[PDB]
């Protein structure tokens, strides 16, 4: 079908999208320490 191709299309690009480690900046610190 059409959505079947789209579903597997996302799978192919998802394999190479998990090779990077991301570290976000959370608004927290040792304020109480």
């Amino acid at each position: 079908s059409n959505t079947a191709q789209r579903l597997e299309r996302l799978r192919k690009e998802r394999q190479n999208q998990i090779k990077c480690k991301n570290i976000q900046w959370k608004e927290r610190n040792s304020k109480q320490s």
Binding site: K19, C20, K21, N22, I23, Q24, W25, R28, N29, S30
Partner: protein
């Protein structure tokens, strides 16, 4: 592969970073840095990972293996990042951004929360670390130099002259002086803190060297703390001395032809372990290796397509 005693890297507007060697002008590896420009790059103390930060993201690249991708990336900030740095033991990373924040990042994969945020009223251009790794110097576009102490939570504000933005500030590893330059070329030098024990963070005005009539871009000492190279927008770099601040050697890349009309500025410089050869990265799409005595260049690297505004050059402790 970064498994060499001496490594060298350059980056700029070409969206790629080129790795070189001092032995020969060949290029080893080309990495990918998409939809961004590299402001400044530095290598971790472990010499197994390099840091490249620009426009709201700090992309980390691998050196031991051959990975053309930013394996480790950081986000959260909303503006550009002026500079990056690391502790001598590789514990935490301090970054200064254009969003008027000079924060500290924690490299421990746990909820240690070793991060501190410092707020200023103007965007900052240069961030430096004290040689004892206990203080911190932050400078904004208002010309006010802030001395931040990690032990306490108070920062002294020092301003030599207002209305002129500063661009760089560096402290020699031997802890003998403290120099900074601004948008007019004046390179103020302050004798650093004498209270090495309790960190009394006292400063006095030592001298002022009038040079670099045009904009001043970057100033940096040498590992032996006997030289001082100050970049400038007039396509010239001057190396000073710590004895009486006389012109030890003057360097220029001007072709002498009026038809060029400032073809490219001189952005950064870096010394070797023995403080004998210097590496300069100009905005003429190439970088050169100079010598402090003969003046004539040693090698030349021309693998970039666009201008390069940052370079990282380090080797082993032995020199």
């Amino acid at each position: 592969v970064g498994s060499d005693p001496v490594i060298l890297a350059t980056a700029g507007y070409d969206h790629t970073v080129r790795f070189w060697q001092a032995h020969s002008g060949i290029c080893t590896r080309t990495v990918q840095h998409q939809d961004s420009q590299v402001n400044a790059l530095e290598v971790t103390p472990d010499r197994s990972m390099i840091a490249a930060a620009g426009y709201q993201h700090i992309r980390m690249y691998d050196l031991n293996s051959n990975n053309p991708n930013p394996i480790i990336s950081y986000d959260g900030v909303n503006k550009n990042i002026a500079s990056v740095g690391f502790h001598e033991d590789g514990r935490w990373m301090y970054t200064g951004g254009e969003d008027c924040t000079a924060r500290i990042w924690d490299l421990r994969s746990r909820n240690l929360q070793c991060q501190r945020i410092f707020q200023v009223n103007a965007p900052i251009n240069c961030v430096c670390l004290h040689p004892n790794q206990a203080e911190l110097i932050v400078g904004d576009q208002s010309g006010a130099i802030h001395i931040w102490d990690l032990k306490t939570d108070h920062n002294e504000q020092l301003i030599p002259e207002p209305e002129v933005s500063i661009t760089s500030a560096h402290i020699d590893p031997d802890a003998s002086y403290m120099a900074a330059v601004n948008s007019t070329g004046n390179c103020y030098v302050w004798n650093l803190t004498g209270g090495i024990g309790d960190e009394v963070t006292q400063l006095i005005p030592k001298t002022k060297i009038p040079a670099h009539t045009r904009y001043a871009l970057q100033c940096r000492f040498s590992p032996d703390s006997t030289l001082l190279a100050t970049c400038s927008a007039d396509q010239t770099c001057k190396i000073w001395r710590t004895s009486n601040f006389s012109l030890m050697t003057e360097l220029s890349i001007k072709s002498g032809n009026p038809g060029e009309s400032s073809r490219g500025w001189m952005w950064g410089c870096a010394f070797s372990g023995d403080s004998q050869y210097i590496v300069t990265a100009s905005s003429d799409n190439l970088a050169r290796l100079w010598c402090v005595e003969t003046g004539e260049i040693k090698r030349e690297y021309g693998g970039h397509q666009k201008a390069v505004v940052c370079l990282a050059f380090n080797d082993s402790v032995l020199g």
